[PDB]
Protein: Heat shock protein HSP 90-alpha
Amino acid sequence: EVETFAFQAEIAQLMSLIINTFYSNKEIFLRELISNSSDALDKIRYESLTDPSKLDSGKELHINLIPNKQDRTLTIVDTGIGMTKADLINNLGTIAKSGTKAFMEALQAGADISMIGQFGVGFYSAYLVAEKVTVITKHNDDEQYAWESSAGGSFTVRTDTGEPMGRGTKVILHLKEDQTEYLEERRIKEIVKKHSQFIGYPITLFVEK
Ligand SMILES: Cc1cccc(C(N)=O)c1C
Structure:
């Protein structure tokens, strides 16, 4: 049972701009996804301060980066608050319509694509490096869902029969053929050190056989 949705016109335009604009500094996608994970971790931490049972779904608060060269995927995993099905459909819990408007008003006014996270739409920077993005998420108040999009104006949502995650989100980047540098350990380490060195949760870079 797969539901297919149209992006709002403004979000489709944002994704088109990200995919078609010549812009060499693609590495900032990772900082944006790690920052999103940190924000989601902050949220479940705050909820747990007054209700410790919020962590019954998992006490550990962390971020894992998992490259897989056989699948050509880079996965950013966190044990943050996750998203409900409603959140997923509603632009992954963001105010992406108004954020896009502000972002595109900044671009013609001096800004560049690297400032996308200041407008609350940093998730879509995934499409700098990914031909397809899969988002698997579990929120304490809902079941486990998979969102997916290869851009082109539409996204899908289905219940996820995959490996139960407990609580949190996995962002699976199906990398473009010419972007496989982002699977190499030394490249990922360099980027995390450059742009994510002060994130307040452990970031574990997995290695491959
Ligand atoms: C905005 C967004 C998109 C995809 C995943 C996540 C996350 N890690 O919870 C967020 C905050």
